[PDB]
Amino acid sequence: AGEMDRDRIESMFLESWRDYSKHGWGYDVYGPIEHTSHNMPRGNQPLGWIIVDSVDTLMLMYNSSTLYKSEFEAEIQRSEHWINDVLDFDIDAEVNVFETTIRMLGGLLSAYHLSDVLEVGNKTVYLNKAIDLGDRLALAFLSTQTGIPYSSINLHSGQAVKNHADGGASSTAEFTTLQMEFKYLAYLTGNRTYWELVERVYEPLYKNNDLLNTYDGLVPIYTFPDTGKFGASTIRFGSRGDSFYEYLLKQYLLTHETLYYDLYRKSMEGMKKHLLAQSKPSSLWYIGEREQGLQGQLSPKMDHLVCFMGGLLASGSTEGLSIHEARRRPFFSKSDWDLAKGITDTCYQMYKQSSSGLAPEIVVFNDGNIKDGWWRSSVGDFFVKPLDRHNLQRPETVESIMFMYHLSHDHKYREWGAEIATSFFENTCVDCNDPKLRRFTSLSDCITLPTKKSNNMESFWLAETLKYLYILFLDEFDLTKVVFNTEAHPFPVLDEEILKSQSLTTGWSL
Ligand SMILES: *[C@@H]1O[C@H](CO)[C@@H](O[C@H]2O[C@H](CO)[C@@H](O[C@@H]3O[C@H](CO[C@H]4O[C@H](CO[C@H]5O[C@H](CO)[C@@H](O)[C@H](O)[C@@H]5O)[C@@H](O)[C@H](O[C@H]5O[C@H](CO)[C@@H](O)[C@H](O)[C@@H]5O)[C@@H]4O)[C@@H](O)[C@H](O[C@H]4O[C@H](CO)[C@@H](O)[C@H](O)[C@@H]4O)[C@@H]3O)[C@H](O)[C@H]2NC(C)=O)[C@H](O)[C@H]1NC(C)=O
Ligand SMILES: *[C@@H]1O[C@H](CO)[C@@H](O[C@@H]2O[C@H](CO)[C@@H](O[C@@H]3O[C@H](CO[C@H]4O[C@H](CO)[C@@H](O)[C@H](O)[C@@H]4O)[C@@H](O)[C@H](O[C@H]4O[C@H](CO)[C@@H](O)[C@H](O)[C@@H]4O)[C@@H]3O)[C@H](O)[C@H]2NC(C)=O)[C@H](O)[C@H]1NC(C)=O
Ligand SMILES: *[C@@H]1O[C@H](CO)[C@@H](O)[C@H](O)[C@H]1NC(C)=O
Ligand SMILES: OC[C@H]1NC[C@@H](O)[C@@H](O)[C@@H]1O
Ligand SMILES: [Ca+2]
């Protein structure tokens, strides 16, 4: 029953939310096991890490809840008042530009959007907060000549600070996963500066590295901000690389700027050419890594983070349309669609073949060359290294499952989603038999049974994992009218004509 699994997912969310609100209200970091909490800034001022990241999930559930609508409404109010009255981003502390942009700036923007379209709360509260934070973060683009920002910035002074390690290089995905957020902010404010600054990073990236010709659109994970040149590093769709590809497509879906689709196409073909492979014995499609350039060997290691590719590929091929209607359009990519189904299956298998039914942080697919103390999956398609056995309540697989279900309408995806939701329920719960004290937490080990719990609840458990599971069981969700930022914060597809009138156009080319 769709509405039933809906009640269940809403219940799981509320159990986590009730516990968080009771013990760690207003804190950035929260541990459900010991009910402990703290803020990230050295000064102990809150960033709204969990509250801001969760507001839009509260709004989505409020909009369709039949059993807890009233509770969700009250929590939105609680969150909104706190965001307006307590949260203050004028903090003398250095924060990571990427994380703060995708979680806080993005969450405030989507809260504004849903508040607007769902007519709940005061959208102005979120927009005003977004403008102020956006201005603090935007200062990061004034540090180098290339326009590529250093990893962190002080929210009060505006002073930028380079990455501590990696020879001072910035992570490629970190400055190429800020575009949806700043462009939507430009759209809402009419302030072109946000748009101009965030689009600026691509030219040096592509030009200075001969990215298309030399790398076939595949990016090493580190880029020096002052030169715009890649640092000797791994090429992977996992951490520090993943969302660079994500936002190439999502910008096109959001603003209709074709250049980014063209760039996206180039990277996808490059990915199929250099990183794609199949495991044994199930022939599951997976995306590997190239630690030593494209000329080196292909590593079968894959971050759970890569699993978002199922949804991305499906979204890019259909542009949000049901396959039924998409299959007849000129822009439909049969290749991308088939691979989307393939990668989503593979990622589902990472749960299905797991002893706990939950996929670990990282897996190593079987390429017939796994010839020590590694754990083998049920079928043997992949292994799990002793140090990668943790599960941080990540959303990437349920993310892709949601897209596949709504675009294909194949009920098999809702079945998969249900199994994973149940595995999270049974294997990450604390006080599992008491709905009054029950809550959910991360795992230090999701391979051993019973699973070993870690005292921490990721904000994305609420912002993404439960959100995508919830949307999966919504009977109607038009993917042609929304584009999710990388933290599952939905933005509306922008009107081309309005963008034109605001002088928001592609300021570079290739
Ligand atoms: C948050 O929740 C809200 C709901 O609470 C949700 O908003 C929408 O949810 C549904 C999305 O699928 C949507 O229902 C679909 O509506 C289709 C369009 O036809 C119907 O809506 C028309 C437009 O409604 C707006 O304008 C109305 C004034 O014109 C206004 O009164 C209304 O409040 C909306 O603002 C409306 O004009 C149509 O009217 C015709 O039909 C009436 C009878 O229903 C008749 O009385 C009228 O004279 C006229 O002939 C019509 O009501 C509809 O095509 C679609 O049908 C499909 O869905 C069924 C589901 O059972 C399937 O069997 C099959 O697929 C079928 O084809 C479906 O009913 C709601 O109307 C929206 N609600 C509101 C109030 O906006 C929102 O999406 C959600 N947000 C999120 C992200 O969670
Ligand atoms: C569209 O959106 C953009 C992006 O956010 C906005 O641009 C920002 O605009 C503000 C204000 O115009 C800029 O901030 C101001 O910068 C001035 C110049 O900075 C130089 O001097 C400081 C020394 O203090 C150096 O640290 C810095 O490196 C530069 O050399 C400052 O002089 C201003 O300071 C004054 O205001 C602050 C406010 O708290 C006071 O504390 C100070 O004492 C002083 O009175 C101020 O900081 C900001 O740089 C712009 N950001 C970017 C990325 O461009 C647009 O304003 C907005 N609307 C428009 C016009 O399109
Ligand atoms: C909405 O919030 C804005 C900013 O806090 C405030 O100025 C406005 O009065 C609020 N609207 C109302 C009256 O609810
Ligand atoms: O796995 C989730 C966590 N890291 C990856 C990000 O893109 C976002 O999904 C969240 O911050
Ligand atoms: Ca993501």
From Swiss-Prot:
Keyword Nucleus among UniProt keywords: no
Record's function text: Involved in glycoprotein quality control as it is important for the targeting of misfolded glycoproteins for degradation. It primarily trims a single alpha-1,2-linked mannose residue from Man(9)GlcNAc(2) to produce Man(8)GlcNAc(2), but at high enzyme concentrations it further trims the carbohydrates to Man(5)GlcNAc(2).
Pathway stated in the Swiss-Prot or TrEMBL entry: Protein modification; protein glycosylation
GO biological process: one example: ERAD pathway
Assembly information from the UniProt record: Homodimer.
Cofactor(s) the protein requires to work: Ca(2+)
Compartments in which it is found: Endoplasmic reticulum membrane
Disulfide-bond pairs as recorded: C307-C347, C429-C432
Enzyme Commission (EC) number: 3.2.1.113
Membrane topology category: Single-pass type II membrane protein
A Gene Ontology molecular function term of the record: calcium ion binding
Residues binding Ca(2+): T486
Reactions the enzyme catalyzes: N(4)-(alpha-D-Man-(1->2)-alpha-D-Man-(1->2)-alpha-D-Man-(1->3)-[alpha-D-Man-(1->2)-alpha-D-Man-(1->3)-[alpha-D-Man-(1->2)-alpha-D-Man-(1->6)]-alpha-D-Man-(1->6)]-beta-D-Man-(1->4)-beta-D-GlcNAc-(1->4)-beta-D-GlcNAc)-L-asparaginyl-[protein] (N-glucan mannose isomer 9A1,2,3B1,2,3) + 4 H2O = N(4)-(alpha-D-Man-(1->3)-[alpha-D-Man-(1->3)-[alpha-D-Man-(1->6)]-alpha-D-Man-(1->6)]-beta-D-Man-(1->4)-beta-D-GlcNAc-(1->4)-beta-D-GlcNAc)-L-asparaginyl-[protein] (N-glucan mannose isomer 5A1,2) + 4 beta-D-mannose; N(4)-(alpha-D-Man-(1->2)-alpha-D-Man-(1->2)-alpha-D-Man-(1->3)-[alpha-D-Man-(1->3)-[alpha-D-Man-(1->2)-alpha-D-Man-(1->6)]-alpha-D-Man-(1->6)]-beta-D-Man-(1->4)-beta-D-GlcNAc-(1->4)-beta-D-GlcNAc)-L-asparaginyl-[protein] (N-glucan mannose isomer 8A1,2,3B1,3) + 3 H2O = N(4)-(alpha-D-Man-(1->3)-[alpha-D-Man-(1->3)-[alpha-D-Man-(1->6)]-alpha-D-Man-(1->6)]-beta-D-Man-(1->4)-beta-D-GlcNAc-(1->4)-beta-D-GlcNAc)-L-asparaginyl-[protein] (N-glucan mannose isomer 5A1,2) + 3 beta-D-mannose
Keyword Kinase found: no
Main localization category: endoplasmic reticulum
Residues bearing carbohydrate: N63, N122, N191
Lumenal face residues: 1-321
Note, other: Present with 8260 molecules/cell in log phase SD medium.
Source organism phylogeny: Eukaryota, Fungi, Dikarya, Ascomycota, Saccharomycotina
Full protein name: Endoplasmic reticulum mannosyl-oligosaccharide 1,2-alpha-mannosidase
Result of knocking out the encoding gene: No visible phenotype.
Organism the protein comes from: Saccharomyces cerevisiae (strain ATCC 204508 / S288c) (Baker's yeast)
Record InterPro entries: 6hp_glycosidase-like_sf, Glyco_hydro_47, Glycosyl_Hydrolase_47, Seven-hairpin_glycosidases
GO cellular component annotations of the record: endoplasmic reticulum; endoplasmic reticulum membrane; membrane
SUPFAM superfamilies, per the entry: Seven-hairpin glycosidases
Keywords from the named record: Calcium, Disulfide bond, Endoplasmic reticulum, Glycoprotein, Glycosidase, Hydrolase, Membrane, Metal-binding, Signal-anchor, Transmembrane, Transmembrane helix
Gene responsible for this protein: MNS1
Domain of life: Eukaryota
